[PDB]
């Protein structure tokens, strides 16, 4: 739901805030699926990829590639 272009616009601290937010959303989704009340299975994959994106961007800024 968020693209690498938009992520590169946020400050370092805003990215870390978004990473916590996504981890909380993933946690809620896992519980909803264990309870069997989650209709859209695909939200798990998308949230997980969103976490991976934020990590990638953060690492690029440390390595000086951005």
């Amino acid at each position: 739901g968020t693209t690498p272009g938009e992520l590169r616009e946020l400050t370092d601290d805003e990215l870390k805030d978004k990473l916590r937010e996504s981890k909380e959303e993933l946690f809620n989704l896992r519980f909803q699926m264990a309870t069997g009340q989650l209709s859209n299975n695909r939200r798990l994959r998308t949230v997980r990829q969103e976490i991976a994106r934020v990590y990638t961007v953060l690492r690029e800024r440390e390595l000086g590639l951005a």
């Binding site: 981890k23 993933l26 946690f27 519980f31 699926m33």
Partner: peptide, 13 residues
């Protein structure tokens, strides 16, 4: 970066 969260430990009910 590593951003540890408590929710990483607790996988499912």
């Amino acid at each position: 970066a590593t951003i540890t969260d408590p929710r990483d430990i607790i996988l499912a009910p």
